[PDB]
């Protein structure tokens, strides 16, 4: 499915900033300067998540 380009999925659990669970869909709204941190929105709120822990859904 073509998804929002800022729709990401968590690759790993990440615990706080936003806590995410592997497989969780997140909406990335923003990056820090180098994009290693994402201001992301999930079903649980917004906060920073590391890019290293997430990946865009689209391919």
Measured from the CB of residue 18, what is the shortest distance to Na ion in angstroms? 18
* Token pair listed for 8: 């990401």
Measured from the CB of residue 35, what is the shortest distance to Na ion in angstroms? 14
**In sequence order, which residues have a C-beta less than 8 Å from that of residue 17 and are 6 or more positions away?**
47, 48, 49
CB 27 within 8 A of CB 40: yes
Measured from the CB of residue 55, what is the shortest distance to Na ion in angstroms? 3
Q: Tell me which residues touch Na ion (CB under 5 A).
A: 55-56, 59
**Judged by CB, which is closer to Na ion: 34, or 59?**
59
């Amino acid at each position: 499915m073509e998804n929002d380009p800022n729709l990401f999925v968590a690759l790993y659990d990440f615990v706080a900033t936003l806590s995410i669970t592997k497989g969780e869909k997140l909406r990335v709204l923003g990056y820090n300067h180098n994009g290693e941190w994402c201001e992301a929105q999930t079903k649980n709120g917004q906060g920073w998540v590391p890019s290293a822990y997430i990946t865009p859904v689209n391919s």
